Amino acid sequence: HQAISPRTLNAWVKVVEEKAFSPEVIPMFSALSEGATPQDLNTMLNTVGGHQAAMQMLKETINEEAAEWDRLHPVAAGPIAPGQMREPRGSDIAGTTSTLQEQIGWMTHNPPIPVGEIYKRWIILGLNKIVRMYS
Amino acid sequence: MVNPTVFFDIAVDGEPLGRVSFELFADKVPKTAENFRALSTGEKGFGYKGSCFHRIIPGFMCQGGDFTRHNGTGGKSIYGEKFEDENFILKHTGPGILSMANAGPNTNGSQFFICTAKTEWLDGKHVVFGKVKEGMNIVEAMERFGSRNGKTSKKITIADCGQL
Numbered sequence A: 001h002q003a004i005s006p007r008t009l010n011a012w013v014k015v016v017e018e019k020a021f022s023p024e025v026i027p028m029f030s031a032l033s034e035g036a037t038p039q040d041l042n043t044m045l046n047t048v049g050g051h052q053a054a055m056q057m058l059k060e061t062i063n064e065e066a067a068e069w070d071r072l073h074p075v076a077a078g079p080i081a082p083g084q085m086r087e088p089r090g091s092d093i094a095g096t097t098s099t100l101q102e103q104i105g106w107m108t109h110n111p112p113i114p115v116g117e118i119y120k121r122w123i124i125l126g127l128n129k130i131v132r133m134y135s
Numbered sequence B: 001m002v003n004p005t006v007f008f009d010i011a012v013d014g015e016p017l018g019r020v021s022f023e024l025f026a027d028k029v030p031k032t033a034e035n036f037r038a039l040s041t042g043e044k045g046f047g048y049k050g051s052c053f054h055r056i057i058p059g060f061m062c063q064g065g066d067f068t069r070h071n072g073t074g075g076k077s078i079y080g081e082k083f084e085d086e087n088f089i090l091k092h093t094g095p096g097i098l099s100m101a102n103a104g105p106n107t108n109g110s111q112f113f114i115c116t117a118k119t120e121w122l123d124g125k126h127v128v129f130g131k132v133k134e135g136m137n138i139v140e141a142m143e144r145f146g147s148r149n150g151k152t153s154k155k156i157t158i159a160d161c162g163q164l
Helices: A006-018 A025-032 A038-047 A052-072 A100-108 A115-134 B030-041 B136-143
Strands: B005-012 B015-024 B055-057 B061-064 B097-100 B112-115 B128-132 B156-163
Touching: A006 A025, A006 A038, A025 A115, A038 A100, A038 A115, A052 A115, A100 A115, B005 B030, B005 B136, B015 B030, B015 B136, B030 B128, B030 B156, B061 B136, B061 B156
Parallel strands: none
Antiparallel strands: B005 B015, B005 B156, B015 B128, B055 B061, B061 B112, B097 B112, B097 B128
16 A cells, blocks of 8 residues: 555656646546555646646536436445445545545455546546547 | 333244333433334334334344335435434443434434444444333344344344334
8 A cells, every 4th residue: 555656746747747638648647547546546636736727627527426426326324334334425436535544445345346446537537528628 | 201112022034032122312312212202103104013124233233214115225204304413412332222323414214223232433423312121132132133244034023013
């Protein structure tokens, strides 16, 4: 376990600086975000400055996806057994109501739940929505 | 008395096992107590008679009360809607404690669990509303049919239930 690096972040920065919303941002986001936890995905997104309207389209996508997820995964009743974890919720996958450790556990369980890969798909749909508007 | 007492007669694959009785703390959580009591008598036309303990985790708890779907995804209260967490005054202090299963805050229906250990970490998330009076020996036996993920090895049913 290590947080995405300042170094990888620089790159993502330089990419968005010039390729803000050409189709080439998408293949780059996907490489720079390999093995990313939700937290790291959000760290990437946060370094983006300005582009407020575009970010908001992306957020709207994330919010829609997360609600769909929840829909498709009703929580079972009963108290969570010891050494077990609650099934992630939309907001958990998006890193707004989950922790690192939690994120980390899921991506490892056998079989895992790769909350990082899931969130990253949502983000990509969001980036396709940006690209379609602007280019 | 203010606090009612309810019994379950437990059977294992139809074979009688023994009776468990529960004091329900109507004096602290009357709405929750009144739900379980009324589901125990069948006085609403539906309730726990016949239903099964679908999830038993040895050293943790026995859960049941899903008399509509029998697997954890159902259950219904007497209120015509899932009901709020009344309070969290009572704590999960040991074996015998009877608590609401729930699927998130303020989603109480009919599912409940009987603790077989101290589970203090549940405090604040499941409403405690009663405790086993007689027959913890029988809950201990029931536990023997559980598994790490809760699946049971025999069908553990409430063959009969009511108020004493």
